[PDB]
């Protein structure tokens, strides 16, 4: 009777609270925070997929109702199939977006650390007059240029990847943009460093 209506409304409420959960969730602002959101959403998404079994069971118990109540029951089933479809598609899209975000953020983080580490090294080296071997200094700078020429292509590859996500209207725009800005800033610092260095080689 009403224990029936209550069960269908319970399933509806579950779907509805999770729609709320998916719709309002964060994306992350750095590698560890994005990984956490992705990890968390993977479990939520599995749970949503698994929820289907409860709907197909409610669907199965269809033939258990008397003729006078099958109509209303099916109506409610239709609402449930509908809301669930919305939820599942929202959850898939969130997973997809989290995966592409994580991939981009992970690659950018790696290149930011490489750049920062390279800067430390090159700052440590004695480029000044105290180092009297101008030949050795020139050979080091050349080796640096060689490395940066390769690295620059990778950085460009990353910026483009970010642009693709934006063109895609990725819902984590702010995080993507902030990593694009971070990469460009670090690159400019590296370029600046190269200028300081060549000042000692003239």
mmCIF file of C-alpha atoms in Angstrom:
data_model
loop_
_atom_site.group_PDB
_atom_site.id
_atom_site.type_symbol
_atom_site.label_atom_id
_atom_site.label_comp_id
_atom_site.label_asym_id
_atom_site.label_seq_id
_atom_site.Cartn_x
_atom_site.Cartn_y
_atom_site.Cartn_z
ATOM 1 C CA UNK A 1 0.000 0.000 0.000
ATOM 2 C CA UNK A 2 1.716 3.151 1.255
ATOM 3 C CA UNK A 3 4.777 1.029 2.060
ATOM 4 C CA UNK A 4 4.970 0.651 -1.715
ATOM 5 C CA UNK A 5 4.808 4.380 -2.447
ATOM 6 C CA UNK A 6 7.344 4.908 0.317
ATOM 7 C CA UNK A 7 9.824 2.522 -1.293
ATOM 8 C CA UNK A 8 9.652 4.200 -4.691
ATOM 9 C CA UNK A 9 9.930 7.620 -3.065
ATOM 10 C CA UNK A 10 12.941 6.322 -1.146
ATOM 11 C CA UNK A 11 14.626 5.328 -4.419
ATOM 12 C CA UNK A 12 13.711 8.718 -5.891
ATOM 13 C CA UNK A 13 15.114 10.512 -2.835
ATOM 14 C CA UNK A 14 18.379 8.590 -3.112
ATOM 15 C CA UNK A 15 18.743 9.585 -6.764
ATOM 16 C CA UNK A 16 17.831 13.172 -5.922
ATOM 17 C CA UNK A 17 20.293 13.604 -3.058
ATOM 18 C CA UNK A 18 23.057 12.216 -5.257
ATOM 19 C CA UNK A 19 22.118 14.569 -8.092
ATOM 20 C CA UNK A 20 22.571 17.323 -5.525
ATOM 21 C CA UNK A 21 25.912 15.791 -4.510
ATOM 22 C CA UNK A 22 27.229 15.525 -8.072
ATOM 23 C CA UNK A 23 26.018 18.989 -9.118
ATOM 24 C CA UNK A 24 27.664 20.837 -6.244
ATOM 25 C CA UNK A 25 31.009 19.069 -5.908
ATOM 26 C CA UNK A 26 34.405 20.785 -6.277
ATOM 27 C CA UNK A 27 37.061 20.082 -8.925
ATOM 28 C CA UNK A 28 40.310 20.729 -7.082
ATOM 29 C CA UNK A 29 42.914 23.475 -7.368
ATOM 30 C CA UNK A 30 46.145 21.445 -7.434
ATOM 31 C CA UNK A 31 47.382 17.877 -7.964
ATOM 32 C CA UNK A 32 46.605 16.348 -4.553
ATOM 33 C CA UNK A 33 43.191 18.072 -4.351
ATOM 34 C CA UNK A 34 42.228 16.990 -7.878
ATOM 35 C CA UNK A 35 43.332 13.414 -7.183
ATOM 36 C CA UNK A 36 41.175 13.385 -4.061
ATOM 37 C CA UNK A 37 38.083 14.584 -5.959
ATOM 38 C CA UNK A 38 38.712 11.993 -8.688
ATOM 39 C CA UNK A 39 39.243 9.194 -6.180
ATOM 40 C CA UNK A 40 36.119 10.183 -4.295
ATOM 41 C CA UNK A 41 34.021 10.481 -7.433
ATOM 42 C CA UNK A 42 35.107 7.073 -8.728
ATOM 43 C CA UNK A 43 33.489 5.497 -5.672
ATOM 44 C CA UNK A 44 30.352 7.627 -5.993
ATOM 45 C CA UNK A 45 30.073 6.732 -9.670
ATOM 46 C CA UNK A 46 30.429 3.004 -9.021
ATOM 47 C CA UNK A 47 27.683 3.325 -6.415
ATOM 48 C CA UNK A 48 25.432 5.084 -8.950
ATOM 49 C CA UNK A 49 25.984 2.369 -11.573
ATOM 50 C CA UNK A 50 25.240 -0.289 -8.951
ATOM 51 C CA UNK A 51 22.010 1.503 -8.023
ATOM 52 C CA UNK A 52 20.438 0.296 -11.284
ATOM 53 C CA UNK A 53 19.920 -3.166 -9.771
ATOM 54 C CA UNK A 54 17.456 -1.629 -7.312
ATOM 55 C CA UNK A 55 15.537 0.026 -10.136
ATOM 56 C CA UNK A 56 15.387 -3.158 -12.219
ATOM 57 C CA UNK A 57 14.054 -4.939 -9.136
ATOM 58 C CA UNK A 58 11.312 -2.363 -8.632
ATOM 59 C CA UNK A 59 10.634 -2.868 -12.349
ATOM 60 C CA UNK A 60 10.465 -6.639 -11.841
ATOM 61 C CA UNK A 61 7.968 -6.461 -8.967
ATOM 62 C CA UNK A 62 5.668 -4.760 -11.478
ATOM 63 C CA UNK A 63 3.612 -7.891 -12.109
ATOM 64 C CA UNK A 64 2.920 -8.168 -8.387
ATOM 65 C CA UNK A 65 0.463 -5.271 -8.321
ATOM 66 C CA UNK A 66 -3.276 -5.628 -8.869
ATOM 67 C CA UNK A 67 -4.713 -4.009 -12.029
ATOM 68 C CA UNK A 68 -6.089 -1.012 -10.131
ATOM 69 C CA UNK A 69 -2.665 0.063 -8.839
ATOM 70 C CA UNK A 70 -0.309 -0.858 -11.695
ATOM 71 C CA UNK A 71 -0.969 2.459 -13.438
ATOM 72 C CA UNK A 72 0.206 4.687 -10.593
ATOM 73 C CA UNK A 73 3.175 2.418 -9.869
ATOM 74 C CA UNK A 74 4.383 2.583 -13.479
ATOM 75 C CA UNK A 75 3.960 6.367 -13.498
ATOM 76 C CA UNK A 76 6.364 6.568 -10.558
ATOM 77 C CA UNK A 77 8.735 4.121 -12.239
ATOM 78 C CA UNK A 78 8.811 6.445 -15.245
ATOM 79 C CA UNK A 79 9.822 9.313 -12.990
ATOM 80 C CA UNK A 80 12.524 7.108 -11.447
ATOM 81 C CA UNK A 81 13.945 5.943 -14.791
ATOM 82 C CA UNK A 82 13.989 9.593 -15.848
ATOM 83 C CA UNK A 83 15.746 11.086 -12.825
ATOM 84 C CA UNK A 84 18.216 8.205 -12.737
ATOM 85 C CA UNK A 85 19.194 8.779 -16.357
ATOM 86 C CA UNK A 86 19.941 12.415 -15.563
ATOM 87 C CA UNK A 87 21.993 11.386 -12.539
ATOM 88 C CA UNK A 88 24.017 8.763 -14.421
ATOM 89 C CA UNK A 89 24.832 11.116 -17.276
ATOM 90 C CA UNK A 90 25.835 13.852 -14.856
ATOM 91 C CA UNK A 91 28.058 11.368 -13.022
ATOM 92 C CA UNK A 92 29.721 10.143 -16.233
ATOM 93 C CA UNK A 93 30.434 13.677 -17.382
ATOM 94 C CA UNK A 94 31.869 14.591 -13.978
ATOM 95 C CA UNK A 95 34.131 11.522 -14.071
ATOM 96 C CA UNK A 96 35.268 12.385 -17.593
ATOM 97 C CA UNK A 97 35.992 15.992 -16.670
ATOM 98 C CA UNK A 98 37.861 14.951 -13.526
ATOM 99 C CA UNK A 99 39.990 12.541 -15.541
ATOM 100 C CA UNK A 100 40.951 15.124 -18.170
ATOM 101 C CA UNK A 101 41.608 17.705 -15.426
ATOM 102 C CA UNK A 102 43.809 15.304 -13.493
ATOM 103 C CA UNK A 103 45.818 14.411 -16.606
ATOM 104 C CA UNK A 104 46.467 18.096 -17.417
ATOM 105 C CA UNK A 105 47.167 19.146 -13.832
ATOM 106 C CA UNK A 106 49.529 16.182 -13.297
ATOM 107 C CA UNK A 107 51.567 16.982 -16.427
ATOM 108 C CA UNK A 108 51.729 20.696 -15.645
ATOM 109 C CA UNK A 109 52.813 20.045 -12.058
ATOM 110 C CA UNK A 110 55.626 17.834 -13.335
ATOM 111 C CA UNK A 111 56.883 20.556 -15.715
ATOM 112 C CA UNK A 112 56.620 23.251 -13.015
ATOM 113 C CA UNK A 113 58.821 21.158 -10.713
ATOM 114 C CA UNK A 114 61.326 20.498 -13.484
ATOM 115 C CA UNK A 115 61.589 24.209 -14.273
ATOM 116 C CA UNK A 116 61.988 25.184 -10.623
ATOM 117 C CA UNK A 117 64.638 22.517 -10.079
ATOM 118 C CA UNK A 118 66.534 23.578 -13.230
ATOM 119 C CA UNK A 119 66.475 27.183 -12.034
ATOM 120 C CA UNK A 120 67.982 26.204 -8.692
ATOM 121 C CA UNK A 121 70.805 24.344 -10.415
ATOM 122 C CA UNK A 122 71.636 27.143 -12.860
ATOM 123 C CA UNK A 123 71.518 29.768 -10.082
ATOM 124 C CA UNK A 124 73.977 27.721 -8.029
ATOM 125 C CA UNK A 125 76.581 27.650 -10.808
ATOM 126 C CA UNK A 126 79.299 30.346 -10.746
ATOM 127 C CA UNK A 127 78.782 32.511 -13.826
ATOM 128 C CA UNK A 128 80.702 35.517 -12.451
ATOM 129 C CA UNK A 129 84.246 36.762 -13.090
ATOM 130 C CA UNK A 130 85.377 34.775 -10.044
ATOM 131 C CA UNK A 131 85.025 31.852 -12.444
ATOM 132 C CA UNK A 132 87.799 32.643 -14.929
ATOM 133 C CA UNK A 133 87.050 29.864 -17.436
ATOM 134 C CA UNK A 134 84.926 31.656 -20.056
ATOM 135 C CA UNK A 135 85.144 28.560 -22.273
ATOM 136 C CA UNK A 136 83.621 26.308 -19.622
ATOM 137 C CA UNK A 137 80.852 28.813 -18.910
ATOM 138 C CA UNK A 138 79.944 29.066 -22.605
ATOM 139 C CA UNK A 139 79.772 25.275 -22.885
ATOM 140 C CA UNK A 140 77.441 25.104 -19.886
ATOM 141 C CA UNK A 141 75.137 27.795 -21.252
ATOM 142 C CA UNK A 142 75.033 25.972 -24.595
ATOM 143 C CA UNK A 143 74.011 22.776 -22.812
ATOM 144 C CA UNK A 144 71.297 24.746 -20.997
ATOM 145 C CA UNK A 145 69.968 26.212 -24.265
ATOM 146 C CA UNK A 146 69.870 22.752 -25.809
ATOM 147 C CA UNK A 147 67.754 21.467 -22.917
ATOM 148 C CA UNK A 148 65.417 24.463 -22.918
ATOM 149 C CA UNK A 149 64.782 24.165 -26.655
ATOM 150 C CA UNK A 150 63.401 20.683 -26.093
ATOM 151 C CA UNK A 151 61.527 21.664 -22.926
ATOM 152 C CA UNK A 152 59.897 24.617 -24.656
ATOM 153 C CA UNK A 153 58.072 22.293 -27.085
ATOM 154 C CA UNK A 154 56.662 20.291 -24.179
ATOM 155 C CA UNK A 155 55.480 23.486 -22.469
ATOM 156 C CA UNK A 156 53.765 24.571 -25.698
ATOM 157 C CA UNK A 157 52.176 21.130 -25.945
ATOM 158 C CA UNK A 158 50.782 21.659 -22.424
ATOM 159 C CA UNK A 159 49.389 25.135 -23.082
ATOM 160 C CA UNK A 160 47.557 23.785 -26.160
ATOM 161 C CA UNK A 161 46.136 20.915 -24.098
ATOM 162 C CA UNK A 162 44.787 23.454 -21.630
ATOM 163 C CA UNK A 163 43.283 25.507 -24.460
ATOM 164 C CA UNK A 164 41.502 22.394 -25.764
ATOM 165 C CA UNK A 165 39.919 21.899 -22.345
ATOM 166 C CA UNK A 166 38.766 25.537 -22.327
ATOM 167 C CA UNK A 167 37.414 25.290 -25.873
ATOM 168 C CA UNK A 168 35.531 22.277 -24.501
ATOM 169 C CA UNK A 169 33.993 24.507 -21.853
ATOM 170 C CA UNK A 170 35.603 22.401 -19.095
ATOM 171 C CA UNK A 171 33.765 23.140 -15.828
ATOM 172 C CA UNK A 172 37.117 23.412 -13.985
ATOM 173 C CA UNK A 173 38.155 26.462 -16.022
ATOM 174 C CA UNK A 174 39.647 28.386 -13.058
ATOM 175 C CA UNK A 175 42.030 25.550 -12.189
ATOM 176 C CA UNK A 176 43.093 25.065 -15.830
ATOM 177 C CA UNK A 177 43.663 28.795 -16.322
ATOM 178 C CA UNK A 178 45.681 29.039 -13.117
ATOM 179 C CA UNK A 179 48.010 26.270 -14.307
ATOM 180 C CA UNK A 180 48.350 27.932 -17.701
ATOM 181 C CA UNK A 181 49.352 31.160 -15.944
ATOM 182 C CA UNK A 182 51.730 29.272 -13.635
ATOM 183 C CA UNK A 183 53.493 27.632 -16.590
ATOM 184 C CA UNK A 184 53.846 30.910 -18.477
ATOM 185 C CA UNK A 185 55.181 32.653 -15.352
ATOM 186 C CA UNK A 186 57.770 29.942 -14.681
ATOM 187 C CA UNK A 187 58.828 29.965 -18.324
ATOM 188 C CA UNK A 188 59.268 33.738 -18.268
ATOM 189 C CA UNK A 189 61.390 33.417 -15.113
ATOM 190 C CA UNK A 190 63.554 30.857 -16.910
ATOM 191 C CA UNK A 191 63.923 33.218 -19.885
ATOM 192 C CA UNK A 192 64.811 36.013 -17.469
ATOM 193 C CA UNK A 193 67.456 33.769 -15.910
ATOM 194 C CA UNK A 194 68.972 33.059 -19.326
ATOM 195 C CA UNK A 195 69.353 36.807 -19.853
ATOM 196 C CA UNK A 196 71.150 37.280 -16.509
ATOM 197 C CA UNK A 197 73.463 34.442 -17.459
ATOM 198 C CA UNK A 198 74.352 35.752 -20.910
ATOM 199 C CA UNK A 199 75.169 39.065 -19.239
ATOM 200 C CA UNK A 200 78.169 37.260 -17.715
ATOM 201 C CA UNK A 201 79.213 35.744 -21.046
ATOM 202 C CA UNK A 202 79.618 39.070 -22.864
#
